[PDB]
Symmetry: D3
Subunit: 167 residues, 6 copies
């Protein structure tokens, strides 16, 4: 089933405010860029919509409804265009925006690659059932991050989450 051309279209989900998270995304892009099976990678934070009537826009502050609708839509559009999702999922500071997108994608029957990260590998290992059962493939970000450059995104082989306590 070798692809004649790359067909993997990635929706790269991830927070992007403070460092560490911004760094993860950076390397993620690099790895995916090196992957032969990828045709396109979409990252919600690259572009950005500008609402002419919105003065002194501040991130985290009150935003115009026009900016909100267009930005939210850009993300749903990215999910729509994608064939699969890749989420740089911080296990230390759960991101509800990412979890929402994971559920939205699974509702559309799309495969979802979870790439969990933790700075406390010695602390408890537990995951919410919806995330644990919702994702179709798990790739540890702390010790297997680099396989994003080799994973066959044309078919996304499944790999159930295991080894995590579930609640």
């Amino acid at each position: 089933m070798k692809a004649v051309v790359p067909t993997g279209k990635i929706y790269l989900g991830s927070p992007f405010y403070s460092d560490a998270q911004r760094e993860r995304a950076a390397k993620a892009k690099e790895l995916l860029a090196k992957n032969p099976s990828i045709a396109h990678v979409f990252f919600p934070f690259d572009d950005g919509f500008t609402d002419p009537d919105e003065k002194n826009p501040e991130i985290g502050g009150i935003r115009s409804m026009v900016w909100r609708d267009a930005t939210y839509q850009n993300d749903l559009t990215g999910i729509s265009n994608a064939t699969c999702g890749v989420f740089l999922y911080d296990m230390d500071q759960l991101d509800d925006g990412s979890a929402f997108e994971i559920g939205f994608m699974r509702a559309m029957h799309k495969p979802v690659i979870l790439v969990p990260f933790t700075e406390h590998p010695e602390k408890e290992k537990k995951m919410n059932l919806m995330i644990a059962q919702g994702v179709t493939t798990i790739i540890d970000g702390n010790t297997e991050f680099e396989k994003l450059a080799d994973y066959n995104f044309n078919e996304c082989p499944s790999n159930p989450v295991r080894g995590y306590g579930i609640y």
Copy 2:
């Protein structure tokens, strides 16, 4: 458009481990029980699946794949049967399981009622864009919790999230 019979089928999403959360759900049920527009309310934590081959099952610990699949499915089945979602959303400790369900439901074009709770009403007021834009109706849990007994679940009038900083 008065309903001839109750048609609202609620999927009540909410964490249910430690107190406070368990208490919120309790009162939520009571309010919904008093609502004339509700035909059924589903709460994932009421029943529970038992896997005969699973000995000494512990919540938060390793669970059998059979238990995981059946429990996860019970929840998706609840979402499928529901006409709308009601989420007792802890703004202090974001729950990714709930966020996942919100996204799954919105992917199915179903209305979602967000009922946010916060023990720090004086701290910053901010919400993730996906949640803020994804939900169709917001009812403050801290000061408007009781309108769950009167909200017309037969039609779920929209009420966009506003007053929250967005990130």
Copy 3:
């Protein structure tokens, strides 16, 4: 098969500007209200108020009002089991058409109740709509069966007798 309770949940779509439109919708309601297989009926014009909108129908509306109103409609479509469209064949309403496509994409049954006021012109209909709708009830002569139609099962009734384009 004999509903132990009405299960029909109608999304009633139709324009609501002119006296004519308001009329058809008024009778539509009365009829459906007599149908025993209906548990609920939703009509988009029965509204949202944007506290921060200093508003004029047909004018520039706030994005908040637009989002809330558009959603109330999608919400009615989500909740509904089937759609009933008072389709004016003389003044094609793209809002209604949009909704018909939305509902069909969701695989829900759609009942088209067309009106023409101009019998002289050849009865034509766009391909999408002719093929998209699952049941047609002529409004000019069959408007009455909306009170008898079994919305618990929504029997099929292909569109015929219309030039397709």
Copy 4:
């Protein structure tokens, strides 16, 4: 929680008038009618409507699946019905729960099931052993019950 009123809307999928099958569907209808959690039950063969007949009947079935909240399939394991299988897959794609009720007149034979069906269905109720359960099953919530005990291919 306890439903303020019957919420379950069943799409009863089953082959017909080919001996026994007609009997199965018959008893099933009776059992379901005794169930307090059901608001409505649809059976593609009760009511009835060339490419015109085909489309209308096909559509009448998709409409039944659309209005339905869950699917119940009197699944004959001795003669696989692709119509029912198509419908099971259609309902699962819509995220709707599916109750499989397998029947076999040959228990002496291998006990096997296609993976898509075994994993696709959310609840199994054996037709030869617990057919009567259709009258007690809570269709307002359709509790899951994974398929087990079947060799899979």
Copy 5:
């Protein structure tokens, strides 16, 4: 990010052979062909196939919508096409982005749009003012651009 290859698959929705319309679709095809982000463009009237013709043609269009990644509609504001509107609603229900390209030969008249269309579409590109943009628009990501400047009803 920059696509390793054209990813956009356009479903071009437009009325046909009714004067002007044929011209619009014509130029649109040329503009899209110049777009480096497009992998494929489907136009319901190019290729062509009674209830047999109806079903086949209808289906050929739903198949085009299915394979499509986005929708581009040459929307005539002077004569509302319910076919295109049906398709816009169908694509939005599938969560696919829709580019609306409105055209009007009467700018002196009121500027109004039905709410379902104004809110349903995700990106607007005026046909009279910026038709040429179809050649530059990045169809690999379909950036949103909400409808504004239209009275809504």
Copy 6:
């Protein structure tokens, strides 16, 4: 309209037990492999390994293997643009049928390539499948066009010449 790149993404569904089945699928691949409108082809039997499964085909499989395998198939269906089913009319495969229904619910085009090995029996076909499939290519005499069929657009081709049941 002349794809600036192949866009066809086929989900090839079919049983893979007997020599006959393995054959049809083998030729199916070779054919599709010659088609220039295909960008990718997915065949479910090309597998998952459960590290904790001490395994026998057709036997009791671990739930982990079942979930992973079932998902790889749904994943192939999600990624695909259309389905191609080598449908054995003599030994109806409910797994393939399930997938055909799943794909149609997603509104994707489905190409049925039936085989019969028993021309003597009247050509019959279940209603769902006859109406569900969007294009039929006889495998006993038209197997070859899978190498020419334009999967970029997937031209429709209604099922006819089969007793419906």
